[PDB]
C-alpha cells in the first residue's frame, strides 16, 4: 500500500491555514472550516487551470471566499494584476463593503457613474497598481467594454453568474474575448438544474476543454437521472476540479438559524372598542381615491397605533395619572410582551426592542421603569439607568433590554451580548429590519408580536410576500381585513395559551437559546397570504354606523361676604405692590434635552422656564434654585417679596426676566415658580399635593398660548416621585404639548 501518489505522482502541495491569510492582509473575519477548505480549493484551482465555479449555496460566504482568494494570490506570488469583479447591481454595495472590511490593503476602485464619470475614470488609467480590485455591474461593463478589454486581468470574478447560462448571451460573447488568466464564477442556484446550463458555465470556464460542439455528446453521456454508480463516478470525477457546491445542511458550523418567529396575540376591550370607533370616525365619505388614498393612510396609522396600545391617543388615558397593572391589560400586545420578557429574564437572554413610533418608545420606557428592567435608549434623553434610579433596579443592574429606533439606528452601538430581538412595532418594509437586526451578530432569536386577524397580520404577510419577490422576481381591501366575526364578541380574547406555548416554542439552554400552530409561526422560507373572506361583517357594521326662601338669605350673606372681600382686597392693594399673575377665569412632541434649564436655548427667541415651589420657600436647598441665583438672582428677591406678604397659594405663578439679550430684544428668558406643595407650614410641616399642579399647568398653558413662547421644565425627580412624575409628564403633554405649545424638558 505504498501506492499513495498513484495519480500521476502529483505532490500533495500545501494547506493554506487561517494564520497565513491573516498575515497576508486579511483582517475582517475568522473563516469557517468549509470556507477555509474552499479558499484552499480556489488557490489550487487558480494554480492549475483557467477558471472554476464556486457553487456554494447562497449565504455561505462566497464573496468573502473570493476576497480571501485575492488575499492569498496577492500575498503568495505577488499577483498585483487587475482583479475584475462583475456583479449584479443590487450586490455591488455588498461587494464594495466587504472588500474594504476584509481586505483593506487591497485598493478597490468602482468603475461606476455616467459619461462624465466614464471620462473621469478614463483619467485614472495610470496603471500604477493604485487599483487592485475593479468592481463593476454587468451593464456598465457591457457598455464600456472598449476600456474593459485592455488590461492583463489575472482574475475575473463573475458573481451570481447564472446570467451566463445562455451560451449566446451578449455579455458571454463579450467576456469570452477578454485577457483573463483565471475566470471564477459564483453561482448560488443549483447549476445541476439543467446539464445545458452547467455545460454553458463550464465552457465559459474552459473554452477549449468543454468545447461547444461537444454539448450534445455531454448531455447524451449523462442523460440518466438515476445514480448509476458505475457511470456516476465518471461525472463526479470530471466535475471535481471545476465545481464546488455545499448545501446548508452539509455545514454543522453554520451560524444558528436565528429562527424568526411570528407570535400571535389577542386584543383588549378598549382596543376593539377604539378600533371600531376609529373605523367609524370619518365614515370613509369619499368615493374611490380622491381622499381615501390619504384618509386610509391616516386610518392605518391610527389602527396600528391602537394595536400597539390605545394610550397613544390623547384622551384614552384616564384622568387619574398613575402606573398600575392596567398597562399590561390595556393591550394584548403589551401583555404578550410582558410574558415574553418574563420568560426571557427567566432564561437569561438580553434582548433588543426596536420602535418605529417614538411615543411607543416612551411608553415601553415607562413600562420598563414600572416593572423594573434595566435599559438604554436611542435618542432624546433617558433617566431609568440615569438620574437617581441607576443605583438600584428590581431587575439586574447590568443592561437587560435595549431600546432602539429604525430611523435613528445609525448612531452606532455595540450589542454583542444580545441574542434575542423583538419587533413589537413591525415596519411595513422589512428592509429596515435587516440592518436593524444586523447589530445582533456583526443562537439569535427574532420575534415579532402581531395581533391575530388584525391590520398587522396583513401588513406583515404582504411584507413577507414582497420580501420573497427578490430572488425569483387594494389599500381599501387590505385595510379592511374583514375578520371581525372573531372580534364580534366585544371581549378582549386575552391570550393565555402562550403561558405554555412559550415554553413549547424554545427549550432554552443554560446560557443561550437551544433550538405554524396555535400562536407560533416559524418563517422557514414559505409562502404566506390572506384573503379577508368574511367582509359581510364589515358591510353590516358599515350600515349600522350609517344608521346613526333660603337662597334669599344666601344672596344677602354672599353680598356681605363679597363686600368684606372688596374691603380686604383694597387693604392688600394699598398696603404695597402686592399682586398675582395667573387667574382661573380670565378670558405635540415632548422633546427632551440635556443641560440645565437655567440656560434655555430651544429655538432662541423667548424662553419660559418653569419651577415648582411652596408658600414661603424663600432661600434654601440648592440645585436649580442656586443655578437661577447665578442667573441675575431675580427669583430670590421677587419670591422674597411675595412671601413677605402672603401672596400665593395652591397654584399661581409670577413671571419675570433675567439679565438681557442683545441678539434679539424681543426674546427673553421668562421664568415661572409654580406652587404645588402643601400649605401645612403653620406647624413647619411639608408635603406635596398634585391636584393643584393640574390647574397650575392650566394657567401656564393659557399664558404660553397668549405669549406663544417656548416652555422649559425641570426633571422633577431625585426623590420617590415616580407617580407624580408619570402623571406630571402625562399632564404636561395633556396641557402643554398635546395642546400646541413648544415644551422642552431639561435633563442633566
Amino acid at each position, epitope marked *: 500500500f505504498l501506492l499513495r501518489l498513484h495519480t500521476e505522482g502529483r505532490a500533495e502541495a500545501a494547506r493554506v491555514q487561517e494564520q497565513d491569510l491573516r498575515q497576508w492582509g486579511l483582517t475582517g473575519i475568522h473563516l469557517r472550516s468549509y470556507q477555509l477548505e474552499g479558499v484552499n480549493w480556489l488557490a489550487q484551482r487558480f494554480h492549475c487551470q483557467n477558471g472554476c465555479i464556486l457553487g456554494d449555496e447562497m449565504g455561505l460566504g462566497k464573496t468573502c471566499q473570493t476576497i480571501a482568494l485575492f488575499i492569498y494570490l496577492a500575498g503568495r506570488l505577488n499577483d498585483e494584476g487587475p482583479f475584475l469583479i462583475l456583479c449584479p447591481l443590487s450586490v*455591488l454595495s455588498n461587494w464594495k463593503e466587504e472588500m474594504q472590511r476584509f481586505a483593506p490593503g487591497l485598493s478597490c476602485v468602482t468603475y*461606476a457613474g455616467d459619461k*462624465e464619470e466614464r471620462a473621469c475614470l478614463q483619467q485614472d488609467l495610470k496603471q500604477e497598481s493604485r487599483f487592485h480590485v475593479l468592481l463593476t455591474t454587468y451593464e456598465i461593463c457591457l457598455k464600456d467594454a472598449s476600456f474593459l478589454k485592455s488590461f492583463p486581468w489575472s482574475v475575473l470574478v463573475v458573481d451570481e453568474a447564472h446570467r451566463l447560462k445562455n451560451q449566446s448571451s451578449l455579455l458571454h460573447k463579450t467576456l469570452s474575448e477578454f485577457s483573463v488568466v483565471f475566470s471564477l464564477l459564483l453561482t448560488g442556484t443549483p447549476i445541476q438544474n439543467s446539464l445545458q446550463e452547467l455545460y454553458s458555465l463550464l465552457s465559459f470556464v474552459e473554452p477549449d476543454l468543454f468545447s461547444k460542439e461537444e454539448v450534445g455528446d455531454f448531455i447524451q453521456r449523462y442523460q440518466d437521472i438515476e445514480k448509476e454508480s458505475e457511470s456516476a463516478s465518471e461525472l463526479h470525477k470530471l466535475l471535481q476540479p471545476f465545481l464546488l457546491r455545499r448545501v446548508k445542511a452539509e455545514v454543522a458550523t453554520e451560524l444558528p438559524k436565528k429562527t424568526e418567529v411570528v407570535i400571535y396575540h389577542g386584543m383588549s376591550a378598549l382596543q376593539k372598542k377604539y378600533y371600531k370607533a376609529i373605523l367609524m370616525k370619518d365614515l370613509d365619505a369619499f368615493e374611490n381615491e380622491t381622499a381615501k388614498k*390619504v384618509k386610509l393612510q391616516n386610518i392605518l396609522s391610527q389602527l396600528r397605533k391602537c394595536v400597539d396600545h390605545p394610550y397613544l391617543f390623547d384622551g384614552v388615558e384616564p384622568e387619574p395619572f398613575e402606573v398600575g397593572d392596567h398597562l399590561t391589560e390595556a393591550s394584548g400586545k403589551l401583555h404578550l410582551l410582558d410574558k415574553l420578557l418574563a420568560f426571557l429574564y427567566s432564561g437569561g437572554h438580553r434582548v433588543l426592542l426596536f420602535s418605529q413610533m417614538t411615543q411607543m418608545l416612551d411608553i415601553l420606557q415607562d413600562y420598563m421603569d414600572y416593572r423594573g428592567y434595566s435599559y438604554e435608549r436611542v435618542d432624546g434623553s433617558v433617566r431609568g439607568e440615569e438620574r437617581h434610579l441607576a443605583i438600584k433596579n428590581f431587575g439586574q443592574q447590568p443592561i437587560f433590554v435595549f431600546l432602539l429606533s*429604525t*430611523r435613528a439606528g*445609525g448612531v*452606532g452601538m455595540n450589542l454583542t451580548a444580545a441574542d434575542t430581538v423583538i419587533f413589537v412595532d413591525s415596519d411595513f418594509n422589512p428592509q429596515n429590519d435587516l440592518q436593524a437586526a444586523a447589530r445582533a451578530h456583526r443562537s439569535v432569536k427574532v420575534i415579532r408580536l402581531i395581533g391575530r386577524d388584525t391590520v398587522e397580520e396583513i401588513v406583515y404577510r404582504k411584507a413577507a410576500s414582497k420580501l420573497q419577490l427578490t430572488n425569483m*422576481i387594494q389599500l381599501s381591501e387590505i385595510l379592511k381585513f374583514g375578520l371581525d366575526k372573531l372580534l364580534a364578541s366585544e371581549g378582549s380574547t386575552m391570550d393565555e395559551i402562550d403561558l405554555e406555548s412559550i415554553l413549547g416554542e424554545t427549550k432554552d439552554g443554560q446560557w443561550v437559546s437551544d433550538a405554524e400552530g396555535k400562536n407560533h409561526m416559524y418563517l422557514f422560507e414559505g409562502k404566506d397570504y390572506s384573503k379577508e373572506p368574511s367582509k359581510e361583517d364589515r358591510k353590516s357594521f358599515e350600515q349600522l354606523v350609517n344608521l346613526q326662601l333660603e337662597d334669599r338669605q344666601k344672596k344677602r350673606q354672599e353680598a356681605a361676604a363679597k363686600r368684606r372681600r372688596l374691603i380686604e382686597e383694597k387693604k392688600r392693594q394699598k398696603e404695597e405692590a402686592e399682586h398675582k399673575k395667573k387667574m382661573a377665569w380670565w378670558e405635540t412632541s415632548l422633546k427632551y434635552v440635556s443641560g440645565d434649564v437655567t440656560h434655555p436655548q430651544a429655538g432662541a427667541e423667548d424662553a419660559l422656564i418653569v419651577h415648582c415651589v411652596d408658600d414661603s420657600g424663600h432661600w434654601g436647598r440648592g440645585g436649580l434654585f442656586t443655578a437661577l441665583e447665578k442667573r441675575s438672582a431675580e427669583p430670590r428677591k421677587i419670591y422674597e417679596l411675595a412671601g413677605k406678604m402672603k401672596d400665593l397659594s395652591l397654584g399661581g405663578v409670577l413671571l419675570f426676566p433675567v439679565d438681557d439679550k442683545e441678539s434679539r430684544n424681543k426674546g427673553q428668558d421668562l421664568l415661572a415658580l409654580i406652587v404645588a406643595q402643601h400649605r401645612d407650614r403653620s406647624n413647619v410641616l411639608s408635603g406635596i399635593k398634585m391636584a393643584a399642579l393640574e390647574e397650575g399647568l392650566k394657567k401656564i398653558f393659557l399664558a404660553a398660548k397668549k405669549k406663544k413662547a417656548s416652555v422649559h421644565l425641570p426633571r422633577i425627580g431625585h426623590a420617590t416621585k415616580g407617580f407624580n412624575w408619570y402623571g406630571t409628564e402625562r399632564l404636561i403633554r395633556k396641557h402643554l404639548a398635546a395642546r400646541g405649545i413648544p415644551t422642552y424638558i431639561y435633563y442633566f
Partner: single-chain antibody
Amino acid sequence: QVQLQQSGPGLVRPSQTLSLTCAISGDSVSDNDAAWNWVRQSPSRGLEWLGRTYYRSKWSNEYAVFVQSRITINPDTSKNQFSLHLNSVTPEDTAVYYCARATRPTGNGLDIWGQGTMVTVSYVLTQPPSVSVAPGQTARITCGGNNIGSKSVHWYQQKPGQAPVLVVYDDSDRPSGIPERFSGSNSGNTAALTISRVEAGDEADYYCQVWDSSSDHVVFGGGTKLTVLS
C-alpha cells in the same frame, strides 16, 4: 433597496426657515458611491432640483442657483441623516419636497426616493406635455436635448400622489422590478422612452432628467402625461 424617510413641518409661515430632515435606513451617509439630493415639486414651478451633497474624499455641497443665496444642506454622520434649510421662504416655495440618492453604479440616476413632505407657506430639454395611446399599442416619449447623447438620461414615472420612481437609468439600463417593455434610447440630440403593450396601469407622468456639467446642477424635464384608452 434603501429607505429614505423624512420629517419636518408641513406648515411653515412666511419669512421663516424651512427645515426638513431626511433620515437614511439601509445605507451610510458617507457612501463613496452616493450623493444625497433635495428636490421639490409643484404644479406651477414644475419639478426643480434644489440641492445636493456628496463625499468624494471631501464633503462637497452643490446648490442650485435658484436658492444659492438662501439654502443650506448639512449632513449628520452621527444621526445618519441630512437636513435641508431654506431662508426667507416666500409663498413661491409652497410645494412638495423629496430626498433622493444619486448612485454611481446607476449613473447617479436617483434610484430610491422619499415619501414627500408638502410644505405650505442652464440647460434646455423638452418633453411632449401630453401623449395619448391605446391599449396594446406602443407609446414613445421624446426627451429632446442639445446633444443629449453626450449625457446620461434618467427616466422616472410618477403616479398621481406618488413619489417619482426611476424607470430607466444610464440611457437604457433598467432597474430590477420594472417590466422589460419599458426601453430607453439616446442618440445625438434626442433621447426616448418606448413603452410596448401599454396597459391601463401605465397612465402617469413621465420625466427625463440629466446633469448639466457646465453649470453643475441637475436638470429635469417638463413632463409627459400618458393617457390610456381602456
